[PDB]
């Protein structure tokens, strides 16, 4: 029952409008002109720099044409491997080259160091420009974080955890007593662990309370990556950036993939993790003890590898909290109520009692919900909006427990 050929054309011409063929021809011309004007562009030149550089900065491009014979030492750039006692430099080059050169007369051997990229002039491959690249990928820009974290009221002060860590982080940075009265160096490390909650907020508070040597938030899940050696290099530049930034503290977070689990499936399941473990130990071993740099490692469960017994000499003072009581919860309410347009005339102690061990994250969540209910009611007031504050906090506590 197909009956299409010839028939379909007749019924396509059977109905239509009186000028349906006209608009079809009109819109085909519309599309024809659309393609023509897309071909008939405006600035029809992919290369840009039309005039603002090509009128005055061009005049100095004549100067670089007069100095075109110099400034050609670019050619190719590659790392260096090692050197002899002083004059000769045995170098591995990105051209796979077993390369040695007399370093260019303008470059002293002191500046050039092993493992640094240097450009070579094709004529003689002299060490002309030893570029200190210090190039950071985008993910590494996330591993490094903001310095001025801003101080608060001990970010919901849990007096136990903060006061135990101040003598191990704040005190060494103050350096008032570490040298003589107590043994040589302050305690070798801090492990600020705990269930998802107050973890690393006290670190941020310590960062604000201390000098400009401020922490960077690196993630172990980011650190573990594809292929081999990238995680090793990432940890190395992590230490380099922290060392350069006034010897700031390095905050390792979520240490359950960089150290992995306590096991490896067949020593081939997670072996790049093991590659990162060897180099990280080589970096944060300290060698010569130094009260300048600090390291803090924070996870939720003590799932660290075998170095968990070497760290008593390197990373000691394992502390935790994430267990807010009534006094802790109500103080977190106060510091959060410092924000927004709320005032403490609300009986927020009642809601602190209602939620047993609701962390500090949920309290911030509950405060966020209270503001959301205020804007939903379209009232920007929240100082005296306490009954509405209590109502939205209790109903959302109901939803969190059972929705």
């Amino acid at each position: 029952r197909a009956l299409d050929e010839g028939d379909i054309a007749l019924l396509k011409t059977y109905g239509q409008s009186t000028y349906s063929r006209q608009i079809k021809q009109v819109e085909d011309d519309i599309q024809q002109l659309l393609k023509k004007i897309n071909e008939l562009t405006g600035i029809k030149e992919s290369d840009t720099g039309l005039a603002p550089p090509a009128l005055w900065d061009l005049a100095a491009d004549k100067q670089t044409l007069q100095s075109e014979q110099p400034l050609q030492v670019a050619r190719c750039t590659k790392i260096i491997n090692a050197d002899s006692e002083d004059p000769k430099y045995i170098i591995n080059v990105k051209q796979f080259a077993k390369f040695v050169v007399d370093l260019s007369d303008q470059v002293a051997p002191t500046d050039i160091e092993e493992g640094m990229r240097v450009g070579v002039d094709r004529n003689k491959y002299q060490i002309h420009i030893p570029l200190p690249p210090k190039i950071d990928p985008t993910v590494t820009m996330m591993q490094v974080e903001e310095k001025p974290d801003v101080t608060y009221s001990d970010v919901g002060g849990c007096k136990e955890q903060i006061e135990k860590l101040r003598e191990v982080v704040e005190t060494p940075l103050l350096h008032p007593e570490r040298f003589v009265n107590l043994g040589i160096e302050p305690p070798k490390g801090v492990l600020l662990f705990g269930p998802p909650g107050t973890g690393k907020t006290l670190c941020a508070r310590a960062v604000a309370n201390r000098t400009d040597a401020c922490f960077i938030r690196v993630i172990g899940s980011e650190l573990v990556q594809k292929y081999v050696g990238e995680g090793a290099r990432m940890v190395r530049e992590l230490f380099e950036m922290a060392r350069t930034k006034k010897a700031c503290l390095i905050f390792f977070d979520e240490i359950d993939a960089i150290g992995g689990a306590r096991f490896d499936d067949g020593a081939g399941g997670d072996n790049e993790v093991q590659r990162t473990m060897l180099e990280l130990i080589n970096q944060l071993d300290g060698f010569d003890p130094r009260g300048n740099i600090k390291v803090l490692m924070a996870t939720n469960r003590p799932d660290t590898l075998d170095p968990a017994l070497m760290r008593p000499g390197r990373l000691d003072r394992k502390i935790e909290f994430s267990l807010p009581d009534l006094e802790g919860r109500t103080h977190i309410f106060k510091i959060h109520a410092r924000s927004m347009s709320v005032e403490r005339d609300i009986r927020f102690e009642l809601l602190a009692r209602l939620c047993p061990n609701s962390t500090g994250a949920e309290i911030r969540s509950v405060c966020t919900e209270a503001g959301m209910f205020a804007i939903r009611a379209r009232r920007k007031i929240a100082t005296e909006k306490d009954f509405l504050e209590a109502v939205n906090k209790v109903i959302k506590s109901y939803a969190k427990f059972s929705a």
Binding site: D7, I23, I30, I37, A54, R75, I135, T368
Partner: protein
Amino acid sequence: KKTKGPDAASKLPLVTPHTQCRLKLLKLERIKDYLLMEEEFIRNQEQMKPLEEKQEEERSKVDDLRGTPMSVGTLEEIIDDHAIVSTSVGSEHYVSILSFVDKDLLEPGCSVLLNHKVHAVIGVLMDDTDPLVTVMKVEKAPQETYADIGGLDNQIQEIKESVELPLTHPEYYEEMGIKPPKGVILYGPPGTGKTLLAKAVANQTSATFLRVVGSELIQKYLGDGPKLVRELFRVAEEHAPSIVFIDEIDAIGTKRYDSNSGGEREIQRTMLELLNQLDGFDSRGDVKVIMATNRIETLDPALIRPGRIDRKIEFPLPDEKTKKRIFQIHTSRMTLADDVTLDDLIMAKDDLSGADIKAICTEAGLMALRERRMKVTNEDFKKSKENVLYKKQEGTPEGL
């Protein structure tokens, strides 16, 4: 490497009749006239040049110094005067461009020219036509509007309010000092879901939109599933603040499985990272993450909490009036019949969703076009019911 695309197309989609008539014809004539007058204008202006001033100062100073031979290479790093560019076959050059230096458009990681001989950069290929590693913004700000959907007024109002807390009245909770990126958790029957998409186009009328559907149970060792979306949402903040529509992965990729350990590492990584991004204390931006699912039961307790993921919205089945509206929308383009057989097809129907409505409307035209070709086929009054049965609803042995 990508900021925006030239939007010089979609010439006035508002053709009011959308059917062959004189009003539509006159609008098309005005459209086609306005195209020539522009092609007139630009052609008249480009050739009727304001002034003939030498070689437009182009061939006199720079075009010669750019040279005839050139090679294309990426630009790596920027220094005060020179530029650190990584050309082909792993070649790196520290040379100061001063001809066709558009510093804004050069950027690191972009193709630039090399004049050979004394290798100096002389230009940049701004197009470069190759940002193809992870492409999710290709479908940005979809053209679908509110009018494409109907009969869902309660949900449209709810989603609009949740997404017009920003943009509109941003000072409302700015003074309230919360800046909540709560997002929306959408329920709904499995017979729907792209309505969860069609109701999302209401907010997609403003700013851009991103989609992550199916993805994977992030077996990848780096994870980064929810984490590259965080980067893409950061890119969305760089652009107009976009939304992330993660339908069917808030359920499967974020599953409330009873298992704690040895659970494909998604529970360890994906759920935790989703909460980190959904928390406003970690990431800023007007990005609103629309979580849509057809299994409310598998809501993870972290996703259950309205404290971090608020604005829970339930999508119900269409009612009698909603079924009338959706059928009218889908059959408006097709001119079903002159008798307007509308209520007979939905009055007794139950548990019929948007996808089913689209399918039956499409199959109604196909069956008429099969052999019943009569323009407005007189059989469509009952053939619409003939293909609304269409079996295919559900089939499983007998068991009953």
